[PDB]
Amino acid sequence: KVFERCELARTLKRLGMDGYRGISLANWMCLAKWEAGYNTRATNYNAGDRSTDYGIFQINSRYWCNDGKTPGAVNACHLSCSALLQDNIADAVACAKRVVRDPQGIRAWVAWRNRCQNRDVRQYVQGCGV
């Protein structure tokens, strides 16, 4: 599923993402935008280390979810990576919450640092009524 901007904003807010571990809703929107373009079925294989990023938050199979083919991987979210490819983003959000419970927080995603950190991210939630 490819979410519309404001449709996703309201959905994330209902799932308790606004201010989660000090992270504002607009930061989560900026993240989803540059990670997969609001597309839940996006996957990206990293030929360099044999892992794959899955879904709307492009979560990595090496630490967070299990796909059975990534070497020495762990499954901290206790999920099959398949769960992060559904149209319903509930599990992906539950897993994203887990990722930021680690010290790095939102910085765990490099794209956030490149395209969201220290930027005016207000534009991601403007007019959505959240």
Curated annotation (Swiss-Prot):
Places the protein is found: Secreted
GO molecular-function terms, A-Z: identical protein binding; lysozyme activity
Record-annotated active site: E35, D53
Broad class of where this protein is predominantly found: secreted
Biological process, per Gene Ontology: antimicrobial humoral response; defense response to bacterium; defense response to Gram-negative bacterium; defense response to Gram-positive bacterium; inflammatory response; killing of cells of another organism
Residue intervals of the C-type lysozyme domain: 1-130
EC number: 3.2.1.17
Keyword list, A-Z: Amyloid, Amyloidosis, Antimicrobial, Bacteriolytic enzyme, Disease variant, Disulfide bond, Glycosidase, Hydrolase, Secreted, Signal
Recorded GO CC terms: azurophil granule lumen; extracellular exosome; extracellular region; extracellular space; specific granule lumen; tertiary granule lumen
Note from the entry: Lysozyme C is capable of both hydrolysis and transglycosylation; it also shows a slight esterase activity. It acts rapidly on both peptide-substituted and unsubstituted peptidoglycan, and slowly on chitin oligosaccharides.
Family: Belongs to the glycosyl hydrolase 22 family.
Record note on quaternary structure: Monomer.
Disease as annotated in the protein's UniProt record: Amyloidosis, hereditary systemic 5: A form of hereditary systemic amyloidosis, a disorder characterized by amyloid deposition in multiple tissues resulting in a wide clinical spectrum. AMYLD5 primarily affects the viscera, and the predominant clinical features are renal dysfunction of varying severity, and intra-abdominal bleeding. Inheritance is autosomal dominant.
Name of the protein in its database record: Lysozyme C
